[PDB]
Design an enzyme around this catalytic site. Structure first.
Site: not given
Ligand SMILES: [Cu+2]
Ligand SMILES: [Cu+2]
Ligand code: NA
Ligand code: NA
Lengths: 620, 620
Positions: B289-290, B371, B373-374, B423
C-alpha cells in the site's frame, strides 16, 4: 524505385488517357473511385507494375464498370460490367450532393410539404443521404439518395439548427426523378440559431490565452525520401493515401540493431459506419458508411499551419482523380510531425545513487475529413518504445431532428425544440500483420483468477491463458474487459533471446459494438461491427469488411463471406480487423458545435525485443 | 485569508513546539505522519482554525498516539493512545528502511543462508517490505518488516538484477530483533547486470533526436495567488499537498458567465495497492500500500527543469515534517503548466461556407514519487471544455525473483534466470463531489439494446437507462464495458436551461479489479479494490478506503465499514470512490527499466452547461 510511392498527377492523367484510348471513358462516363493497387506478394524482386483500380459510372443509365489499368504498360488489364442490384451501387458521387435539393425544389409533393410549414423553398437545404436497403423494391438496381431538410435563414446560417422533421424524400439521381415524398405531419422547426461565430452567441472572445510556441530550431528528427518514405527513431514506413480509406500506412518496420524488422505490412481504416438509433420512419433508415459510401479521402481538408497542425510540420499533398479523370491535389492534406510525449522512463534508486529520467516522443501522421455535418481526424502514432496507436477525433455539428413534446427514449434535447438522435460512430481497422515477417498467428489472452487452496494457500495467485485462433471459423471474437482480454499477434518461427515467440499485443478500449437488433438491415450490412475482432487469411481481393460496393448493397459480401472459407491462420499470412466505436448520446455541451471526443486502440511489443528498445535514448 | 493554503515551514515548527510544550514530543518520539486537516463544512464564515493531525511513534516501545493540534490557537485539541493490535500500526518510518538489512547482517540464520549461496554479506541489500497480516500470531501488536535480498556487485549496480530467491526474513524494527528467517532452498542468483547507464548495455546513444522547444514568450495563461490558488481558463482550484496522499485538489470550480460553479470539493488518490500474484511463500505475503503504508507524498521527487517537466513550468515546493517535527521542503515537487491538446472543435460547412477550427489546451498539475523499485507520476488535467482527468504513469524497475527452471504460471522471464512476478497496481480516487454545490446524487447509466418489433420495425433503435443509487447499501458497483456503463453525478435541485439536472459523467477504463481470491487477506484489507465504484455519505473521518492505519491492520475499517451505515445518498453531500488499476504481466521490454504505462479515468460535463462552454475560445 519506390513501388509504394503516392500516386502522382501524371499517373492519374495517364490512367485517364489509357481508359479513353480503350473506349472506356467517353463523355457520359464518371469516375466514382480511383486508386493505386498495392504490389502483389513477393514480386518486389521484379520491375514495377503500377496498377490502378477504377469504378466508372455512366450518367446515361448504362451499367457501371470495374476496371484495372497498368499505368506502367499503358494497358487495360481487366474491365467488367457490374450488375448493381446484385453486387452494390458505386460510391456516392460528389456531383450528386446538390442533385437531391435541386430535384425536390420543383416537386409538387415537396413544395406542398414546405408550404404546410410556411418555409421558403429557396431557404431549404437538403442533405444528400445514403439510402441503404429496406422495403422499397423499386430501388433495387437504381442509384437512390434520401433527403432530409434543414432551413438556412440566410447564406451564412448553420442549417443544422433548423431541422424539418416529419418529412423525408427519396430520389433517383440518374433518371433525375423523385420516387417518394413522405410527410408524417408537421413538427415545429427549431428557431434558435446555432451560429458559433456570431458574437451574440459566443459573447466577447477570451483574452486570457497566452501563446504556446512549439519549434524545432534544427528541424524535425524524421526524414522523408521518395515522396512518402519516413524514417524516424528506428521506425521505417511508407505513408499512402487512398480516396476511400484516407491515409494508409505501409511497411511499418523497426530497425533493431542492424536488422529491419517488419511489424505491420498495411494499416488502414477500411470502413466506418454511423448508425442511428431513432425508430422514427423519418430517420430509421439512416446509416452513413463514410468510408464505403462517401469515400473519406476525397473530402480530406487542406490543413492550415498553426491552426490544424501545430509545431514543425511536414505536409504531403496527395493527388486524387476528379469525376472526369483529371488529377486534383489536396493541398496540405496530410500532416506529419513529431512531438514530446512526457516521461518515457524514470527511476531514482536508493541503493545505486543513480537518478535517471528520459523523455518520450511520438511520430504523428494525420488527416482531417468532412462528410456533411461530421468532421473526423484520423491520427496514427509511432512511439519510441515500439508502441503503435490509432486515434480518431470526432467533431463537427451533431445531426439534428425535432425534440418531441413529452420527450424521447432515442433522442436528446439540445435547445428548445431541437433534438439529436442517438447514434454510434464505428470504425474497422484493417491490420495486415507482418510480425517479423508474414508467418503470424493470433492468440486471445485472458487474465485467469485462481481459487484459494493447495498450491495457493494465501489466495493471492493469478495467471493468464492464451488460446490460439487456428482457423477463420474460430477467429470472430468479442471483448471481455472484466478479464482484461487482449489479442497477441506472434511469429511462431521467430524467437527472442529467451526462446519465446516475438509478438505484439492489441489493447482495445472495449467500447460497445453495434447495438442494432441482429435481424436489422444494418446488422447484416455492417456485420463487422457486431464483433470486436476478426482474423482472416490474407487475400488480395479482401480489402474492406463491407465488400467493394457498400452503397445500397445487402449482406452477402465482406467479412462474413471471407471467414466462411475457414482457412488456416495458425502461422500464415493473416489480417486482423478490429472494430471500435463511440456510442453517442448527444449532450447540450455538443451544441452548437461539438468538442472533440476520441476513440482508438494500440499495439505494444510483447517479447518482440530482447530488452527495452529505448536504452539508447539520450538524456535531456 | 486562504484556509486551503499549503502548510508553511513555520506552521510545522509551531506544531512541533505545541507538541513539545504539551509533553507529547520528547526525545523518544517520532512523527510518522503529519498533515493539515481540511476546514469543516460551513465555518468558512468564521475565522481560520488551522488544525494539524499527527501520528506519533515511540522508539522505546510505548504506545503511539494520534494527535490533533490547533496551530492557530497553540493548543492540543485531542490526544489518544493507540492500541495497534486493534486499530493498525503507524505508517512505515523512513528511518526503518535501513534497519532490516542492518539487523540481518549479524544474524546467524541469515549469514548461514548467504554463505550457502556464496554471497558476500557486504553486497546484500535487503528491501524493507510491509508485512501485512497472515498466520504469525507473535506479530500482532508489533511493528514488523519483511526483507527480501538483492545482490549489489558494486556501489552503482542495480541490485534488482540479482534477486536472492528462496529466502525471506521477518524483523521487529522496534525491539531490533529478527523473528524468523525462512530458507526454502537455493535458487541461482541471476548474473546479467541491469545497468541502464552502462554503455555496454545501452550501446552508443542515439544522435538522431533533434530538439523540441516549447516556450510561452508572454508566460503562462494561469495565475497563482495565495501560494496555491490557481485560476486558468474559467477554472478555479487550490492545489494541496499531503505527505500520505500527495497532491490533493480542493475547490475545483468553473466560472460560467459571472457565477463560480463548484464541481469537485476534494479530489485525491486516497489509496494505492500493489498486490503480487506469485504463490511462492517467499512472496505470497507481498502487497504494498504505497499510499497507506509508505506515504507517497514524502517520497516525492524534486523535478528538474527540461527533464521531468517541459515547457514554461511553475513549481510548488511543499513542506513536510521530518521524523522529529522539523520542516523539510520538497524543492520543485509539484509541476504546474498548460499545454496544447490538439483540436478542440472543427467544422467546415458546405452550406454556410464557414470553416472553423479551434485548439484545445489543458492545465496540468503533477508530481512524481519513488517507493523502492517503483516510480509513479500522478497527473491531474483540466481541459477547456470542462473535462477533468487523472492519469497515473507507472515506471521504475520491476520487482524481480528467480525464474524457475521449467517456467511459471505466475512469473514472467526477463533475462536468463531472472523472473518478474505478476502483480497489479490499483488506485482509489476519492472524489468528494460538489456538482453545483453539495446536494448531489449518483446514477448508473447503461446502454439499452432494443428488440426489433412494434415501435422499432427496422430494429435500429437503442436507448439508455439510469438507476439512482439511493442509499449506501446499493452504491457498490461494478463495471460493465459491454453496456457502456458510466456513472453520473448530478444536482437534483440545479437545472440547466432545458430543465434537466446538471451533471458530470465518470468514464472509467474498465480494467480488471483485484484478482485475489475473495477469502484472502488482501481481499479484506484492500476490499475497496474488489469493486469499481463506491458511493458514501460525506463524513469528516472517512478519509481513506482502507482506514487511517493500514500497516499490519486486518479488515474492520475503511469502505465496507463506512457503507454499513446505509446512509441516504439521494441528494446529499456524497463522495465517489473509483477503483482503477493496471494488471501487469511483465514483458522483456520492461527490463532493465520499464517504459511508462498508464491508467486513469475522466469526468466530462453532462448537461452541466447550457451549450458548449468553449464558444468564446478565439482562433489561432
Ligand atoms: Cu507493475
Ligand atoms: Cu456522434
Ligand atoms: Na499479414
Ligand atoms: Na460531496
Amino acid at each position: 524505385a519506390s513501388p509504394f510511392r503516392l500516386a502522382s498527377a501524371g499517373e492519374i492523367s495517364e490512367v485517364q488517357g489509357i481508359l479513353r484510348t480503350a473506349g472506356l471513358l467517353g463523355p457520359e462516363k464518371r469516375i466514382a473511385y480511383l486508386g493505386v493497387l498495392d504490389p502483389a506478394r513477393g514480386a518486389g524482386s521484379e520491375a514495377e507494375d503500377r496498377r490502378f483500380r477504377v469504378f466508372i459510372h455512366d450518367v446515361s443509365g448504362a451499367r457501371p464498370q470495374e476496371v484495372t489499368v497498368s499505368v506502367t504498360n499503358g494497358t487495360v488489364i481487366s474491365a467488367v460490367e457490374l450488375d448493381t442490384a446484385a453486387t452494390g451501387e458505386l460510391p456516392v458521387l460528389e456531383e450528386e450532393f446538390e442533385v437531391v435539393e435541386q430535384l425536390l425544389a420543383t416537386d409538387e409533393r415537396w413544395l406542398k410539404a414546405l408550404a404546410a410549414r410556411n418555409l421558403d423553398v429557396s431557404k431549404v437545404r437538403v442533405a444528400p443521404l445514403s439510402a441503404g436497403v429496406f422495403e422499397y423494391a423499386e430501388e433495387r438496381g437504381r442509384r437512390i439518395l434520401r433527403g432530409l431538410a434543414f432551413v438556412q435563414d440566410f447564406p451564412e446560417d448553420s442549417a443544422w439548427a433548423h431541422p424539418v422533421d416529419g418529412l423525408v424524400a427519396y430520389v433517383d439521381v440518374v433518371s433525375k426523378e423523385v420516387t417518394r415524398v413522405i410527410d408524417t405531419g408537421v413538427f415545429p422547426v427549431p428557431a434558435e440559431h446555432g451560429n458559433y461565430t456570431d458574437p451574440e452567441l459566443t459573447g466577447p472572445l477570451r483574452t486570457t490565452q497566452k501563446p504556446i510556441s512549439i519549434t524545432q530550431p534544427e528541424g524535425p528528427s524524421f526524414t522523408v525520401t521518395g515522396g512518402n518514405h519516413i524514417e524516424w527513431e528506428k521506425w521505417s514506413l511508407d505513408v499512402g493515401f487512398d480516396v476511400r480509406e484516407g491515409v494508409v500506412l505501409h511497411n511499418i518496420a523497426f530497425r533493431d540493431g542492424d536488422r529491419l524488422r517488419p511489424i505491420i505490412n498495411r494499416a488502414s481504416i477500411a470502413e466506418m459506419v454511423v448508425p442511428y438509433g431513432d425508430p422514427s420512419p423519418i430517420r430509421s433508415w439512416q446509416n452513413y458508411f463514410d468510408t464505403g459510401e462517401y469515400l473519406v479521402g476525397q473530402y480530406a481538408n487542406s490543413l492550415e499551419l498553426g491552426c490544424d497542425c501545430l509545431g514543425d510540420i511536414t505536409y504531403l499533398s496527395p493527388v486524387i482523380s476528379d469525376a472526369f479523370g483529371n488529377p486534383r491535389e489536396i493541398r496540405n492534406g496530410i500532416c506529419m510531425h513529431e512531438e514530446d510525449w512526457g516521461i518515457l522512463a524514470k527511476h531514482s534508486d536508493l541503493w545505486s545513487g543513480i537518478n535517471y529520467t528520459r523523455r518520450n516522443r511520438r511520430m504523428v501522421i494525420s488527416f482531417f475529413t468532412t462528410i456533411g455535418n461530421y468532421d473526423y481526424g484520423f491520427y496514427w502514432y509511432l512511439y519510441l518504445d515500439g508502441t503503435i496507436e490509432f486515434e480518431a477525433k470526432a467533431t463537427g455539428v451533431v445531426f439534428t431532428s425535432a425534440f418531441p413534446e413529452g420527450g424521447s427514449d432515442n433522442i436528446s434535447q439540445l435547445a428548445p425544440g431541437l433534438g439529436a438522435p442517438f447514434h454510434q460512430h464505428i470504425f474497422s481497422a484493417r491490420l495486415d500483420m507482418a510480425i517479423d515477417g508474414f508467418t503470424n498467428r493470433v492468440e486471445e489472452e485472458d487474465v485467469v483468477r485462481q481459487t484459494m487452496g493447495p498450491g495457493n494457500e494465501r489466495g493471492n495467485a493469478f495467471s493468464r491463458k492464451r488460446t490460439v485462433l487456428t482457423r477463420e471459423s474460430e477467429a470472430v471474437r468479442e471483448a471481455d474487459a472484466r478479464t482484461g482480454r487482449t489479442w497477441i499477434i506472434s511469429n511462431p518461427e521467430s524467437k527472442n533471446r529467451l526462446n519465446e515467440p516475438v509478438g505484439y499485443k492489441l489493447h482495445a478500449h472495449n467500447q460497445p459494438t453495434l447495438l442494432a437488433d441482429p435481424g436489422s438491415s444494418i446488422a447484416r450490412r455492417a456485420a463487422f461491427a457486431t464483433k470486436d475482432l476478426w482474423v482472416t487469411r490474407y487475400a488480395d481481393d479482401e480489402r474492406y469488411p463491407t465488400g467493394d460496393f457498400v452503397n445500397q448493397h445487402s449482406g452477402g459480401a465482406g467479412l462474413p463471406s471471407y471467414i466462411a472459407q475457414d482457412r488456416d491462420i495458425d502461422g500464415q499470412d493473416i489480417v486482423v480487423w478490429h472494430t471500435f466505436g463511440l456510442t453517442h448520446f448527444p449532450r447540450v455541451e455538443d451544441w452548437p458545435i461539438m468538442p472533440v471526443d476520441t476513440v482508438g486502440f494500440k499495439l505494444r511489443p510483447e517479447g518482440f525485443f530482447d530488452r527495452s528498445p529505448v536504452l539508447d535514448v539520450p538524456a535531456n
